[PDB]
């Protein structure tokens, strides 16, 4: 990895565009204008890409050679990068202040600020915008995942009277559905801020290396079938496949995809009759978890539950909702996203089925179908010092008031009512709103403040 | 990187689920059911993750330890992985056959197949589904990028009479808007299959390392401003910022973001009057490229062109379309995706503006706002050998006929009319449809056939 080659191309030319005699460039990140966001992911970026000796004579030469051909011209700031190498042993003369990871902040607040600590490096602040802005991803995954948790919590509490099993109710199936191995690890880790279930193995190692947990692992899974393991037996032998699988995993929970040919026949005739004796004998710690994977998500879930309710002994819980026996559950792992999740749980509640009967799986919808514009994540310069004088800077496009950026030196504070406010124009300097909530997390090549994954989960908890 | 930890968790448990006495598992990848797709990206995956010695005693131990905690149980196939280590020096006993990269194939055709070459490794075929399926990303980016090229080609030809400059008409601005550094490189490279412009520097190194080009670099950029470089001068000095920038880059093309405060005032008064003398003197090889970045994309483009057409000498080309003088162009780099692109060029054509006047920049829309379901990318087992007998395997869910998979051994062929057809059930064995277009690209830990980036671009060319 070469930080000199990890920026948008045009930023290579910016050192020639700032006003002459500019000694400071100060910029900030916010989720402009999903009313609250979970701040998570910066620590990974700081450690993997920004800390330590990130400049070498070799990296400078490689960048110079690439840019000469890429621009068909010499515009690369060789002198500037060499200065960092010689003066700071290749450590970035930058200071980043940020809100603690896991914190849940309303939209439109400063989440982190960046500024150069050496006047010669005024151009460096915005050079690293590209890498830092990618924090939009873990923030958005974490936020969208927590919003789904809010829905599950509401419906589980209503139908059951408690939140038992909530943290296992939305499972990450997104490994194959994301754009890369790196994305998989980052995305899965962001989901784990809220839940404990993932099949995206890459997330475990990331958390362990960059954040850390008291527990051996931050996420868990259970044995489960895929279409290949059912279909390989041949169409006429779907029952043999089911029998073999539940027998192989007789003492642990096991998820079995049941829609290979006819989900309804599988539930009613195969599980419901042919193999019923192998299901009712299972332990409460080892249920069979029936998995539909096609058709309209809500219709399928309701029909599967109706079928099962007629083949197995259902009870009515203390809230009046129907509950399958403890050795039998369902997981809907197809077509689940923040929208459909809501429709499913509401539909289940209307038909009197407890949310305790089900878990949900989501892959592309959880980790891939998200963009930087969902929370309007944006990085902008709000303050500069030129000829020794500080000036408050901002953009304010005529046609889009929503794109207006904040002015001057920023700070994040608690309001008298205990809410959040971002003070602009250095106003935090007046001591009218208590201390600034942002902490220095990076300074001159070193990570100065960090959080464990356990702390982050705690900060991200639902009310 | 540890391949034993680079799969969906449940796949760890599959070796106990397949029918007993299974010696072969054969699976394929297709974009089920955007009528044609560009096959690109597999070579990157093969080289980065699958080739050579990918198993070590250490990697086996690490996986065993992770899985014990992740499943809270011992289900890991230690013996199976040890066999690969001891028998093949940790090289994967797998054969992958694929259509040549860059090929444009209609939906619903086999693109690549996977199978184990050692009966003991029947479980390995699908272990690597997760990593291989991630090829959906570069395929989708390449395809979506090419579809945008088709739109630009149609409108440029109509308004100009030729395709000059088509290869630079859609520029990649997606570095910051993607989910990770790795995604950025892969995504940018996929866009470069069709175009030559990118600010996503990560793409250059990827192409150079895994594919290769005759030219020093596969992609290019030009100097350009960002809001920070304009706003840093202070609101009242937007003109000074513009003047400094065009002067610093007087002999090369330069893109200048002009919507910081009022895009219309900037075009009419600043560029159009105050600094007009610095624009009309520019070389045809170094135009000023005005960049709006906010408001309704079509309305803004039309209004900017109308303004410019009244301040600068416009000509009418041989097709009857208006053309700005050669030292002046526009780039619309906001709100551009496959849908809006079409609306913009059609709107321009209606108002008699040549497509020669404009280039488009797309970031999140080009590289992030895409999912695996856009082209229905899916990997499924279609053939197995159990007890020495081959059987054709498939799924066919009752509620969704669209999820039906192909049966048996597959091959890709040309039809007498020159189209494509996928033969099922080993029917390719009959020699009625010429040779199989799939070629062995990976076998037993070695990449057996590779393509240069130049060959790929050639294969991906528009008709
Ligand atoms: C109600 C059940 N409760 C629970 N369930 C689970 C649970 C259920 C199922 C799975 N696993 C699967 O089901 N594995 C299948 C699969 C895997 C990957 C993958 N990738 N896919 C495919 O990936 C594609 C991507 O889809 P895309 O297109 O991208 O959207 C999709 O198609 C998929 O087919 C499919 C799982 F791990 C966990 C866990 C805990 C509880 C719970 O409550 N515990 C606490 C209580 N407990 C305390 C202890 C004592 C007992 C009580
Ligand atoms: C008509 C013009 N013709 C051409 N133009 C170009 C061209 C124009 C502009 C730029 N560069 C910018 O404009 N740089 C700005 C920017 C950069 C990155 C970035 N990241 N961003 C931001 O990234 C965010 C992500 O946005 P998101 O939210 O994710 O969507 C967005 O906001 C952006 O602000 C913004 C560029 F490189 C190239 C090239 C060739 C031709 C052409 O025709 N040559 C052949 C003919 N030629 C032959 C030779 C002789 C002369 C004639």
Which of A167, A177, A228, A253 to mutate to test ligand 1, by most ligand atoms within 8 A of the CB atom? A253
Interior CA angle at A196 toward A194 and A197, to 5°? 115
DSSP H or E segment with residue A359: strand A358-362
Binding-site sequence positions of A: 176, 199, 227, 291-293, 333-334, 364, 372
Assigned token pair, B53: 């010695």
Q: Which tokens go with A112?
A: 């982190």
Provide the chain B residues 269-288 that lie in CB contact (below 8 A) with chain A. none
Dihedral sign for Cα B232, B236, B240, B245, please: positive
Residue B45: name the closest of B109, B138, B110 by CA: B138
Rounded CA separation A454/A460 (Å):
10
Phi-psi region of A21 (alpha: psi -120 to 50; beta: other; left: phi over 0): left
Helix (H) or strand (E) holding A391: strand A389-392
Cα gap B198→B204, rounded to integer Å: 9
Q: How many CB atoms lie within 10 A of CB B459?
A: 18
Tokens of A276: 């019923």
* Residue B133, ligand 2, Cβ within 6 A: no
Alpha-carbon distances, residue B411 vs A227, B422, B428 (angstroms): 22, 6, 6
Bridge partners of residue A152, in order along the sequence: none
Beta bridge partners of B442: B96, B447
Q: How far is CA A15 from CA A20, A212, B94, B287, in A?
A: 10, 38, 51, 21
Dist. CA B67 → ligand 1 center (Å): 16
Question: Domains of chain A (ranges plus CATH)?
Answer: 1-133+372-450 (no CATH), 134-371+451-463 (3.20.20.70)
Q: Do A227 and B180 touch (CB under 8 A)?
A: no
Does the beta carbon of A177 lie inside 6 Å of ligand 1? yes
C-alpha B183/C-alpha B367 separation (Å) is: 8
A209 vs A47, A212, A296, CA distance in Å? Answer: 10, 6, 40
DSSP bridge partners of B94: B116
**What residues in B contact A192, CB-CB < 8 Å?**
none
- Of the candidates A303, A399, A371, the one whose C-alpha atom is nearest the C-alpha of residue A136 is A371
- Angle at Cα A47 formed by Cα A46 and Cα A50, nearest 5°? 55
Exposed/middle/buried for A354, CB within 10 Å: 0-12, 13-18, 19+?
Answer: buried
**Please, which residues have CB within 8 angstroms of residue B82's CB and are 6 or more apart in sequence?**
B60
DSSP one-letter code for A351: T
Contact A111, A143 (CB under 8 A): no
Q: What is the dihedral of CA A93, A97, A100, A106, to 10 degrees?
A: -140
Q: Is B310 exposed, middle or buried (0-12, 13-18, 19+ CB in 10 A)?
A: exposed
- Spatial contact of A39 and A111, defined as CB atoms under 8 Å apart: yes
State how far the Cα of A396 lies from the Cα of B125, in Å rounded to an integer: 55
Query: What is the secondary structure of A31-43 as a DSSP string?
Result: E----EEE---HH
CA distances from A407 to A202, A376, A396, A440, B228 (A): 40, 18, 11, 20, 12
Which are the contacts of A59, defined by CB distance < 8 A and separation ≥ 6?
Answer: A2, A3, A4
Which residues, 6 or more positions from B95, have their beta carbon under 8 angstroms from its beta carbon? Answer: B114, B115, B117, B440, B442, B443, B444
Q: Do B179 and A228 touch (CB under 8 A)?
A: no
- Distances in whole angstroms, Cα of residue A212 to Cα of each of A52, A453, B434: 20, 5, 57
Q: Do A246 and A255 form a contact (C-beta atoms < 8 A)?
A: no
Integer CA distances (angstroms), A314 to A6, A311, A324, B129, B384, in order: 58, 9, 5, 38, 40
- What token pair was written down for B306? 């109308």
Length in residues, chain B:
463
Are the C-beta atoms of A89 and A9 separated by less than 8 Å?
no
**Alpha carbon distance A291, A308 (integer Å):** 12
d(CA B196, CA B178): 19
Task: Report d(CA B134, CA B140) in Å as an integer.
Answer: 10
**Residues from chain B contacting residue A6 (CB–CB below 8 Å):** 181, 201-202
Distance CA A308, CA A302 (A): 10
- Which long-range contacts does A246-250 make (Cβ < 8 Å, 24+ apart)? A246/A275, A246/A278, A246/A279, A246/A282, A246/A288, A247/A278, A248/A223, A248/B16, A248/B17, A249/A223, A249/A286, A249/B13, A249/B16, A250/A282, A250/A286
Strand pairing report for B94-98 and B110-116 = antiparallel
Computed on alpha carbons and rounded to an integer, the radius of gyration of chain B in Å comes to 26
Residue A27 at interface with chain B, using a CB cutoff of 8 Å: yes
CB pairs under 8 A between A and B: 334
Going along B124-260, which residue ranges are E strands?
Answer: 170-172, 254-257
Entry resolution (Å): 1.9
CB A294 within 8 A of CB B400: yes
* Interface check A448 vs B, CB under 8 A: no
Residue B341 — φ and ψ, nearest 5°?
-55, -50
CB atoms within 10 A of CB A440: 12
Comparing C-alpha atoms, which of B48, B180, B176 is closest to residue A367? B180
Judge: A228–B182 Cβ closer than 8 Å, yes or no: no
In whole angstroms, what is the distance from residue A128 CA to residue A5 CA?
Answer: 11
CA distances in angstroms from A289 to A248, A258, A353, B243, listed in the order given: 14, 10, 16, 68
Residue A302: C-alpha distances to residues A36, A293, A324, A393 (Å): 32, 13, 13, 56
* Technique that determined the structure: X-ray
Q: How far is the CA of B392 from the centre of ligand 1 (A)?
A: 28
User: Do the chains contact at A8 and B295, CB–CB below 8 Å?
Assistant: no
B417 Cβ contact partners less than 8 Å away, ≥ 6 residues apart? none
d(CA A27, CA A25): 7
Residues 163-182 of A with CB under 8 A from B: 173, 175-182
- A444-448: list long-range contacts, CB under 8 Å, 24+ apart: A444/A88, A444/A91, A444/A92, A444/A93, A444/A94, A444/A95, A444/A117, A445/A50, A445/A51, A445/A52, A445/A53, A445/A54, A445/A88, A445/A90, A445/A91, A445/A92, A445/A93, A446/A51, A446/A91, A447/A43, A447/A46, A447/A47, A447/A51
CA B162 to chain centre: 26
Give the whole-angstrom CA distance, residue A102 versus residue A38.
6
Q: Which of residues 301-360 of A touch B (CB under 8 A)?
A: none
Residues 378-407 of B with CB under 8 A from A: 379-381, 384, 386, 391, 393-400, 403, 405
First-to-last C-alpha distance (Å) of chain A: 41
CB A303 within 8 A of CB A264: yes
Helix A57-71 to helix A78-88 angle (10° resolution) is: 170
């Amino acid at each position: 990895f070469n930080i000199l080659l990890a920026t948008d191309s045009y930023k290579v030319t910016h050192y020639k565009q700032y006003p002459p005699n500019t000694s400071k460039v100060y910029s900030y990140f916010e989720c402009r204008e999903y009313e609250e966001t979970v701040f998570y992911g910066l620590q990974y970026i700081l450690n993997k890409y920004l800390k330590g000796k990130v400049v070498t004579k070799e990296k400078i030469q490689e960048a110079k050679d690439v840019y000469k051909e890429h621009f068909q011209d010499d515009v690369f700031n060789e002198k500037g990068w060499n200065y960092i190498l010689e003066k700071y042993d290749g450590h970035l003369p930058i200071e980043i202040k940020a809100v603690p990871e896991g914190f849940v902040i309303p939209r439109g607040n400063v989440l982190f600020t960046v500024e150069n600590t050496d006047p010669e490096c005024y151009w460096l602040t915005n050079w690293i915008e590209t890498i830092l802005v990618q924090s939009w991803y873990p923030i958005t995954v974490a936020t969208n995942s927590r919003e789904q948790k809010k829905i599950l919590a509401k419906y589980l509490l209503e139908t059951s009277g408690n939140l038992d099993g909530l943290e296992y109710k939305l499972h990450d199936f997104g490994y194959r559905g994301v754009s890369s191995q790196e994305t998989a690890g980052i995305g899965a880790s962001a989901h784990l801020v809220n839940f404990k279930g993932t099949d995206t193995v890459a997330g475990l190692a990331l958390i362990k290396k960059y954040y850390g947990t008291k527990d051996p692992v931050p996420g868990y899974s259970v044995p489960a079938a895929e279409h290949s393991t059912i279909t390989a037996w041949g169409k006429d032998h779907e029952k043999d496949a089911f029998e073999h699988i539940v027998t192989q995993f007789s003492s642990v929970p096991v998820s079995v995809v049941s829609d290979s040919y006819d989900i309804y026949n599988a539930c009613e005739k195969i599980w419901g009759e042919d193999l019923r004796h192998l299901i009712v004998s299972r332990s409460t710690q080892a249920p069979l978890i029936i998995r539909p994977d096609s058709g309209n998500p809500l219709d399928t879930v309701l029909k599967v539950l109706e079928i099962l309710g007629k083949k197995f002994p259902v009870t009515e819980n203390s809230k009046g909702y129907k509950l399958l026996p403890p050795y039998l559950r369902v997981i809907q792992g197809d077509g689940v996203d923040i929208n459909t999740l809501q429709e499913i749980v509401e539909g289940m509640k209307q038909k009197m089925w407890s949310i305790e009967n089900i878990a949900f799986g989501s892959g592309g919808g959880l980790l891939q179908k998200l963009t930087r514009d969902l929370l309007n994540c944006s990085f902008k310069c709000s303050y500069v010092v030129t000829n020794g004088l500080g000036i408050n800077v901002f953009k304010d496009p005529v046609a889009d008031p929503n794109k207006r950026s904040k002015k001057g030196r920023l700070s994040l504070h608690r309001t008298p009512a205990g809410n959040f406010v971002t003070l602009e124009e250095g106003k935090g300097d007046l001591e009218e709103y208590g201390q600034d909530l942002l902490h220095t997390v990076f300074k001159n090549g070193k990570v100065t403040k960090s959080y464990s994954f356990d702390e982050i989960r705690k900060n991200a908890q639902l009310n």
